[PDB]
Amino acid sequence: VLSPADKTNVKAAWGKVGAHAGEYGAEALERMFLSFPTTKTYFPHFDLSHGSAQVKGHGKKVADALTNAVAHVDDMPNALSALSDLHAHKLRVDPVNFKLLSHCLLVTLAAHLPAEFTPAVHASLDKFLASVSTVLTSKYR
Amino acid sequence: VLSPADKTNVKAAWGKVGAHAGEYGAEALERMFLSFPTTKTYFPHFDLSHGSAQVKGHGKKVADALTNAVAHVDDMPNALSALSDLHAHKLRVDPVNFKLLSHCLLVTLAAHLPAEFTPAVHASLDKFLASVSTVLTSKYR
Amino acid sequence: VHLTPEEKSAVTALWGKVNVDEVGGEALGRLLVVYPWTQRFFESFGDLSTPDAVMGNPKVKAHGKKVLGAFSDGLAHLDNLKGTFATLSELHCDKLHVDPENFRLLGNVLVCVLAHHFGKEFTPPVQAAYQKVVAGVANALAHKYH
Amino acid sequence: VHLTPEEKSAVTALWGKVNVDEVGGEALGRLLVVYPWTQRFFESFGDLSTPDAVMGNPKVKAHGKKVLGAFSDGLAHLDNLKGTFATLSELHCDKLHVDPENFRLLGNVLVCVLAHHFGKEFTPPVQAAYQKVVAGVANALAHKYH
Ligand code: HEM
Ligand code: HEM
Ligand code: HEM
Ligand code: HEM
């Protein structure tokens, strides 16, 4: 639901993200649990302390799932329908915490790419993460 | 997105609502402005006091628009696309206030039909009003 | 700040003027029915699937009376909310980790069941006042995260 | 309750340790760009359409400095938030009627521009602390509705 111009902008900035996808997902879950502590019920078996390796692993997994959503940019509910099923039915996750994690990921993306994080690409990526949360709330089982 | 059973239940309860649609919309806007006063910026020319006639008139209009959404029950974004256009572009209304007014309307519906407001029809009508807010947030211009 | 003393008195007066018995248990049943994924927190109660077994559940009606007594304390000692909501806030934050819009859902479904149980005894000033007192309850019950 | 005294000191210390000048004006420009319907409240500012004219707007950078000074007062006098946020809360409630998630949007975009302006000077404890202080600011600025 984007322009080809800002679609080109987000795929270029996401290439600049690149092989730091696992690192950025790790820090996104780090800031997620440190900031919105209501969410730690969904990861109880982890060690909810400073810098956990399985937190980094699951952050890598979630970040690359978002890279798959990047690679299927206009086909986002089609790409994320299985995860929508998993989250709304298996794990039974409240559907605005996706918006919570989306803004937290924008905070870590702006923290790590400040020489590229223009308000233009900021607005584009915010609309994108709004869309990812939007297609995870349409609980198509 | 409902069963034929609870669809039959909501059309029977909505027939029990009936010609009190204008009255219920009037009291829904009454409780709306008295409860969430952030919303009175969207109706500035009205007299924001006890029991205003134009408030009752616009409540009648909004309630019968929801009756049209009742009469187009499975075709709800198709029915409400023009209002989605109006609200997200013309009036520029924040999209969760539809959920606010939806729960306020459930409060006045339970207040006025307590010998019919079973938790079953309550859950059905809450899913319905969730759907009305859902199709007004998909800002299809 | 908070409300008028006269309207806070109206809050505690009309909450004393409810039929004091099962409004909490019916609100619990209504919350769990109209939102069926809140019982992820309440899986330990057993009877949580069908509404009839919900109303028959001693755990559901006991939790309804427990919430009702907690509301009774929080509205009797309405001046110090954060002093009264201390052990409950600690439980809800640290042990339970309840997502803070579930208190929004519970406060609003309690408002719905009080509207159902009054009808003509529910002035929309009393509704706005009750929305405020349950928002204050939900804030005082979700503050140890923060 | 609220945070540690050491972390509230970290809040006021690192907010003093920002480059104190244009972070508010850039946050305003970022809010109005990434959410383009907040400027329904800000139609009276004139330059609100393109980001370049937004950064060039004396009204935008003046409102940024005004919000920045209000944050300076609200974090210097952090003990009494609701005493400091009095005229601003009256304005935002009675005159402006700002919908209370717009303060959520502004607090979160300020968190984004502070992350942008620090990078390695932004510990996620400092992020969670700042999220808490802007939630407290947004509550103290939206309380005369209630
Ligand atoms: C915003 C986009 C999100 C994406 C793309 C995403 C992606 C994923 C993926 C791919 C998995 C599967 C991991 C596996 O194979 O075990 C997963 C699992 C999970 N997700 Fe997320 N997620 C998102 C948001 C969230 C949020 C906000 C939460 C809130 C707590 C959450 C909670 C979970 C949980 C609890 C699991 C199960 C983890 C496990 O059992 O190991 N997800 N997610
Ligand atoms: C939940 C379902 C809603 C429905 C079905 C609905 C329906 C309508 C309709 C049919 C109109 C056209 C009235 C006319 O012809 O002038 C209208 C106008 C309007 N609606 Fe609603 N509405 C809803 C929710 C809301 C909410 C929550 C607000 C929040 C304040 C809102 C704000 C407005 C405004 C400001 C107008 C313009 C009124 C005027 O200019 O006279 N609507 N709505
Ligand atoms: C809004 C006001 C609320 C009040 C006054 C309240 C009060 C209580 C009380 C009195 C107990 C019993 C503690 C005990 O017996 O040891 C309890 C436990 C519990 N509460 Fe609530 N609660 C509220 C909201 C919620 C919400 C929204 C949820 C969401 C699911 C929730 C979930 C639970 C759970 C899972 C328990 C444990 C069950 C038990 O201990 O028997 N509470 N709370
Ligand atoms: C979160 C912290 C906020 C602070 C500290 C703040 C502070 C201020 C200040 C200092 C003024 C100038 C008052 C004057 O010059 O007389 C003002 C006015 C205003 N604020 Fe904000 N505000 C905040 C949030 C918001 C938000 C989220 C909006 C949403 C649109 C908003 C909209 C306005 C408007 C429209 C004005 C009038 C413009 C003017 O008076 O020049 N404020 N606020």
mmCIF file with all atom_site columns, N, CA and C and ligand atoms in Angstrom, chain A residues 32 39 42-43 58 61-62 65-66 80 83 87 91 93 97-98 101-102 132 136, ligand 1:
data_model
loop_
_atom_site.group_PDB
_atom_site.id
_atom_site.type_symbol
_atom_site.label_atom_id
_atom_site.label_alt_id
_atom_site.label_comp_id
_atom_site.label_asym_id
_atom_site.label_entity_id
_atom_site.label_seq_id
_atom_site.pdbx_PDB_ins_code
_atom_site.Cartn_x
_atom_site.Cartn_y
_atom_site.Cartn_z
_atom_site.occupancy
_atom_site.B_iso_or_equiv
_atom_site.pdbx_formal_charge
_atom_site.auth_seq_id
_atom_site.auth_comp_id
_atom_site.auth_asym_id
_atom_site.auth_atom_id
_atom_site.pdbx_PDB_model_num
ATOM   1   N  N   . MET A 1 32  ? 11.825 -4.241  24.364 1.00 0.00 ? 32  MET A N   1
ATOM   2   C  CA  . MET A 1 32  ? 10.430 -4.633  24.515 1.00 0.00 ? 32  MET A CA  1
ATOM   3   C  C   . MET A 1 32  ? 10.129 -5.086  25.929 1.00 0.00 ? 32  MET A C   1
ATOM   4   N  N   . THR A 1 39  ? 4.382  -7.935  28.846 1.00 0.00 ? 39  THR A N   1
ATOM   5   C  CA  . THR A 1 39  ? 4.626  -8.895  27.787 1.00 0.00 ? 39  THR A CA  1
ATOM   6   C  C   . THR A 1 39  ? 5.479  -10.077 28.213 1.00 0.00 ? 39  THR A C   1
ATOM   7   N  N   . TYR A 1 42  ? 4.347  -13.856 28.113 1.00 0.00 ? 42  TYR A N   1
ATOM   8   C  CA  . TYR A 1 42  ? 4.353  -14.641 26.897 1.00 0.00 ? 42  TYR A CA  1
ATOM   9   C  C   . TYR A 1 42  ? 5.678  -15.333 26.657 1.00 0.00 ? 42  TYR A C   1
ATOM   10  N  N   . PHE A 1 43  ? 6.687  -15.063 27.473 1.00 0.00 ? 43  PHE A N   1
ATOM   11  C  CA  . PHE A 1 43  ? 7.983  -15.733 27.369 1.00 0.00 ? 43  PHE A CA  1
ATOM   12  C  C   . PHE A 1 43  ? 8.463  -16.110 28.761 1.00 0.00 ? 43  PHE A C   1
ATOM   13  N  N   . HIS A 1 58  ? 15.181 -15.624 19.473 1.00 0.00 ? 58  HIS A N   1
ATOM   14  C  CA  . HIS A 1 58  ? 13.813 -15.360 19.042 1.00 0.00 ? 58  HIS A CA  1
ATOM   15  C  C   . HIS A 1 58  ? 13.680 -13.988 18.402 1.00 0.00 ? 58  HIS A C   1
ATOM   16  N  N   . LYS A 1 61  ? 14.606 -14.570 14.921 1.00 0.00 ? 61  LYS A N   1
ATOM   17  C  CA  . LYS A 1 61  ? 13.508 -15.223 14.203 1.00 0.00 ? 61  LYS A CA  1
ATOM   18  C  C   . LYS A 1 61  ? 12.416 -14.233 13.816 1.00 0.00 ? 61  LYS A C   1
ATOM   19  N  N   . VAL A 1 62  ? 12.029 -13.363 14.747 1.00 0.00 ? 62  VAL A N   1
ATOM   20  C  CA  . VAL A 1 62  ? 10.954 -12.413 14.492 1.00 0.00 ? 62  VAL A CA  1
ATOM   21  C  C   . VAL A 1 62  ? 11.402 -11.365 13.485 1.00 0.00 ? 62  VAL A C   1
ATOM   22  N  N   . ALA A 1 65  ? 11.314 -12.906 10.083 1.00 0.00 ? 65  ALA A N   1
ATOM   23  C  CA  . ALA A 1 65  ? 9.925  -12.975 9.638  1.00 0.00 ? 65  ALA A CA  1
ATOM   24  C  C   . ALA A 1 65  ? 9.462  -11.629 9.100  1.00 0.00 ? 65  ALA A C   1
ATOM   25  N  N   . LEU A 1 66  ? 9.907  -10.552 9.731  1.00 0.00 ? 66  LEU A N   1
ATOM   26  C  CA  . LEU A 1 66  ? 9.608  -9.235  9.191  1.00 0.00 ? 66  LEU A CA  1
ATOM   27  C  C   . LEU A 1 66  ? 10.378 -8.968  7.902  1.00 0.00 ? 66  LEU A C   1
ATOM   28  N  N   . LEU A 1 80  ? 1.740  -13.111 6.117  1.00 0.00 ? 80  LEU A N   1
ATOM   29  C  CA  . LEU A 1 80  ? 1.695  -13.207 7.566  1.00 0.00 ? 80  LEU A CA  1
ATOM   30  C  C   . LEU A 1 80  ? 0.440  -13.893 8.092  1.00 0.00 ? 80  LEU A C   1
ATOM   31  N  N   . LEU A 1 83  ? 1.253  -16.700 10.733 1.00 0.00 ? 83  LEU A N   1
ATOM   32  C  CA  . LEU A 1 83  ? 1.603  -16.111 12.016 1.00 0.00 ? 83  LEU A CA  1
ATOM   33  C  C   . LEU A 1 83  ? 0.408  -15.461 12.686 1.00 0.00 ? 83  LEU A C   1
ATOM   34  N  N   . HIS A 1 87  ? -0.629 -16.531 16.384 1.00 0.00 ? 87  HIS A N   1
ATOM   35  C  CA  . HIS A 1 87  ? -0.640 -15.557 17.456 1.00 0.00 ? 87  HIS A CA  1
ATOM   36  C  C   . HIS A 1 87  ? -2.034 -15.390 18.038 1.00 0.00 ? 87  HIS A C   1
ATOM   37  N  N   . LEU A 1 91  ? -1.021 -18.821 20.603 1.00 0.00 ? 91  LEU A N   1
ATOM   38  C  CA  . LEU A 1 91  ? -0.444 -18.101 21.728 1.00 0.00 ? 91  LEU A CA  1
ATOM   39  C  C   . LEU A 1 91  ? -1.423 -17.140 22.382 1.00 0.00 ? 91  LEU A C   1
ATOM   40  N  N   . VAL A 1 93  ? -2.437 -13.809 21.723 1.00 0.00 ? 93  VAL A N   1
ATOM   41  C  CA  . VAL A 1 93  ? -1.754 -12.558 22.017 1.00 0.00 ? 93  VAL A CA  1
ATOM   42  C  C   . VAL A 1 93  ? -2.699 -11.412 21.700 1.00 0.00 ? 93  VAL A C   1
ATOM   43  N  N   . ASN A 1 97  ? -0.191 -5.291  20.885 1.00 0.00 ? 97  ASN A N   1
ATOM   44  C  CA  . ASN A 1 97  ? 1.210  -5.458  21.242 1.00 0.00 ? 97  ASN A CA  1
ATOM   45  C  C   . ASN A 1 97  ? 2.094  -5.585  20.017 1.00 0.00 ? 97  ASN A C   1
ATOM   46  N  N   . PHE A 1 98  ? 1.516  -5.952  18.877 1.00 0.00 ? 98  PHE A N   1
ATOM   47  C  CA  . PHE A 1 98  ? 2.236  -5.862  17.620 1.00 0.00 ? 98  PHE A CA  1
ATOM   48  C  C   . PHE A 1 98  ? 2.554  -4.416  17.283 1.00 0.00 ? 98  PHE A C   1
ATOM   49  N  N   . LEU A 1 101 ? 5.480  -3.504  19.714 1.00 0.00 ? 101 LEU A N   1
ATOM   50  C  CA  . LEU A 1 101 ? 6.769  -3.980  19.229 1.00 0.00 ? 101 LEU A CA  1
ATOM   51  C  C   . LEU A 1 101 ? 7.181  -3.275  17.953 1.00 0.00 ? 101 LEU A C   1
ATOM   52  N  N   . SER A 1 102 ? 6.217  -2.848  17.153 1.00 0.00 ? 102 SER A N   1
ATOM   53  C  CA  . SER A 1 102 ? 6.533  -2.113  15.944 1.00 0.00 ? 102 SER A CA  1
ATOM   54  C  C   . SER A 1 102 ? 7.145  -0.759  16.261 1.00 0.00 ? 102 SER A C   1
ATOM   55  N  N   . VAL A 1 132 ? 1.916  -4.245  9.195  1.00 0.00 ? 132 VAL A N   1
ATOM   56  C  CA  . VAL A 1 132 ? 2.240  -5.567  9.738  1.00 0.00 ? 132 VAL A CA  1
ATOM   57  C  C   . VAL A 1 132 ? 1.354  -5.883  10.937 1.00 0.00 ? 132 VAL A C   1
ATOM   58  N  N   . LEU A 1 136 ? -1.674 -8.705  11.208 1.00 0.00 ? 136 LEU A N   1
ATOM   59  C  CA  . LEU A 1 136 ? -1.742 -9.680  12.281 1.00 0.00 ? 136 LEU A CA  1
ATOM   60  C  C   . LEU A 1 136 ? -2.978 -9.530  13.159 1.00 0.00 ? 136 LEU A C   1
HETATM 61  C  C1  . HEM E 2 .   ? 5.313  -7.593  15.011 1.00 0.00 ? 1   HEM E C1  1
HETATM 62  C  C2  . HEM E 2 .   ? 5.573  -8.683  14.283 1.00 0.00 ? 1   HEM E C2  1
HETATM 63  C  C3  . HEM E 2 .   ? 5.874  -10.097 14.841 1.00 0.00 ? 1   HEM E C3  1
HETATM 64  C  C4  . HEM E 2 .   ? 6.398  -11.058 14.084 1.00 0.00 ? 1   HEM E C4  1
HETATM 65  C  C5  . HEM E 2 .   ? 6.792  -10.917 12.601 1.00 0.00 ? 1   HEM E C5  1
HETATM 66  C  C6  . HEM E 2 .   ? 6.551  -12.248 14.879 1.00 0.00 ? 1   HEM E C6  1
HETATM 67  C  C7  . HEM E 2 .   ? 7.067  -13.432 14.425 1.00 0.00 ? 1   HEM E C7  1
HETATM 68  C  C8  . HEM E 2 .   ? 7.068  -14.612 15.108 1.00 0.00 ? 1   HEM E C8  1
HETATM 69  C  C9  . HEM E 2 .   ? 7.521  -15.884 14.601 1.00 0.00 ? 1   HEM E C9  1
HETATM 70  C  C10 . HEM E 2 .   ? 8.086  -16.169 13.200 1.00 0.00 ? 1   HEM E C10 1
HETATM 71  C  C11 . HEM E 2 .   ? 7.368  -16.790 15.550 1.00 0.00 ? 1   HEM E C11 1
HETATM 72  C  C12 . HEM E 2 .   ? 7.724  -18.283 15.428 1.00 0.00 ? 1   HEM E C12 1
HETATM 73  C  C13 . HEM E 2 .   ? 8.958  -18.618 16.260 1.00 0.00 ? 1   HEM E C13 1
HETATM 74  C  C14 . HEM E 2 .   ? 9.136  -20.110 16.271 1.00 0.00 ? 1   HEM E C14 1
HETATM 75  O  O1  . HEM E 2 .   ? 9.282  -20.701 15.172 1.00 0.00 ? 1   HEM E O1  1
HETATM 76  O  O2  . HEM E 2 .   ? 9.120  -20.705 17.378 1.00 0.00 ? 1   HEM E O2  1
HETATM 77  C  C15 . HEM E 2 .   ? 6.816  -16.119 16.700 1.00 0.00 ? 1   HEM E C15 1
HETATM 78  C  C16 . HEM E 2 .   ? 6.509  -16.707 17.888 1.00 0.00 ? 1   HEM E C16 1
HETATM 79  C  C17 . HEM E 2 .   ? 6.033  -16.035 18.963 1.00 0.00 ? 1   HEM E C17 1
HETATM 80  N  N1  . HEM E 2 .   ? 5.663  -14.712 18.998 1.00 0.00 ? 1   HEM E N1  1
HETATM 81  FE FE1 . HEM E 2 .   ? 6.085  -13.287 17.656 1.00 0.00 ? 1   HEM E FE1 1
HETATM 82  N  N2  . HEM E 2 .   ? 6.103  -11.969 16.147 1.00 0.00 ? 1   HEM E N2  1
HETATM 83  C  C18 . HEM E 2 .   ? 5.660  -10.661 16.161 1.00 0.00 ? 1   HEM E C18 1
HETATM 84  C  C19 . HEM E 2 .   ? 5.136  -10.043 17.260 1.00 0.00 ? 1   HEM E C19 1
HETATM 85  C  C20 . HEM E 2 .   ? 4.956  -10.622 18.477 1.00 0.00 ? 1   HEM E C20 1
HETATM 86  C  C21 . HEM E 2 .   ? 4.623  -9.914  19.678 1.00 0.00 ? 1   HEM E C21 1
HETATM 87  C  C22 . HEM E 2 .   ? 4.430  -8.400  19.836 1.00 0.00 ? 1   HEM E C22 1
HETATM 88  C  C23 . HEM E 2 .   ? 4.537  -10.775 20.665 1.00 0.00 ? 1   HEM E C23 1
HETATM 89  C  C24 . HEM E 2 .   ? 4.186  -10.322 22.094 1.00 0.00 ? 1   HEM E C24 1
HETATM 90  C  C25 . HEM E 2 .   ? 4.649  -10.936 23.182 1.00 0.00 ? 1   HEM E C25 1
HETATM 91  C  C26 . HEM E 2 .   ? 4.789  -12.090 20.114 1.00 0.00 ? 1   HEM E C26 1
HETATM 92  C  C27 . HEM E 2 .   ? 4.781  -13.284 20.777 1.00 0.00 ? 1   HEM E C27 1
HETATM 93  C  C28 . HEM E 2 .   ? 5.238  -14.465 20.280 1.00 0.00 ? 1   HEM E C28 1
HETATM 94  C  C29 . HEM E 2 .   ? 5.350  -15.674 21.048 1.00 0.00 ? 1   HEM E C29 1
HETATM 95  C  C30 . HEM E 2 .   ? 4.964  -15.825 22.530 1.00 0.00 ? 1   HEM E C30 1
HETATM 96  C  C31 . HEM E 2 .   ? 5.825  -16.618 20.255 1.00 0.00 ? 1   HEM E C31 1
HETATM 97  C  C32 . HEM E 2 .   ? 6.122  -18.076 20.637 1.00 0.00 ? 1   HEM E C32 1
HETATM 98  C  C33 . HEM E 2 .   ? 7.610  -18.137 20.962 1.00 0.00 ? 1   HEM E C33 1
HETATM 99  C  C34 . HEM E 2 .   ? 8.028  -19.549 21.255 1.00 0.00 ? 1   HEM E C34 1
HETATM 100 O  O3  . HEM E 2 .   ? 7.145  -20.378 21.581 1.00 0.00 ? 1   HEM E O3  1
HETATM 101 O  O4  . HEM E 2 .   ? 9.245  -19.843 21.151 1.00 0.00 ? 1   HEM E O4  1
HETATM 102 N  N3  . HEM E 2 .   ? 5.049  -11.959 18.769 1.00 0.00 ? 1   HEM E N3  1
HETATM 103 N  N4  . HEM E 2 .   ? 6.641  -14.786 16.401 1.00 0.00 ? 1   HEM E N4  1
#
